[PDB]
Write a protein that binds this DNA or RNA. Structure first.
Length: 94
RNA sequence: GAAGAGUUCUCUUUUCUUUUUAACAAACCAUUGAACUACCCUGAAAUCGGUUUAUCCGGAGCUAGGGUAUGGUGUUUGGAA
């Protein structure tokens, strides 16, 4: 299966936050299990998000597709630069 | 409104003139006129919203709420009656 389907599954039944500021909050709290980073993300931000994840022992997936594709992949009609998944629910993302 | 003047068969509570306030200094300031202009904080937006005369803006963080800065040929005064 593709990550888009897993992302579509985990948003039907699951927990998530969208965007940079909310992602940092879940990484700080320790409830972020997996963060998805858009392919065209700012290069400095990617280093910061990767560092936050390593400190909180969360997985990072730099998956191909821009913030436009990531926004579409979550079913939203706006660009998404980074996702944080606190709960897969019924999906097999983790 | 006031002071003076012009006209006045008749009419005209009339017509005309004067009724000013500098550099500089201080405190405020989007109030009273011009800002959500830029930035920050909270928060996280699809039933998408905000918004200009001019359609641009937002998960790279909208709307909203509260702040910070920019400051006079503005205000209140000193100067200055």
């Amino acid at each position: 299966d593709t990550i888009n389907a897993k992302l579509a599954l985990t948003m039907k039944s699951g927990k998530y936050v969208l965007g940079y500021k909310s992602t940092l909050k879940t990484l700080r709290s320790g409830k972020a299990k997996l963060i998805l980073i858009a392919g065209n993300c700012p290069p400095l931000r990617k280093s910061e998000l990767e560092y936050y994840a390593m400190l909180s022992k969360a997985n990072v997936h730099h998956y191909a597709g821009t913030n436009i594709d990531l926004g579409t992949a979550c079913g939203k009609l706006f660009r998404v630069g980074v996702l944080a998944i606190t709960d897969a629910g019924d999906s097999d993302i983790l």
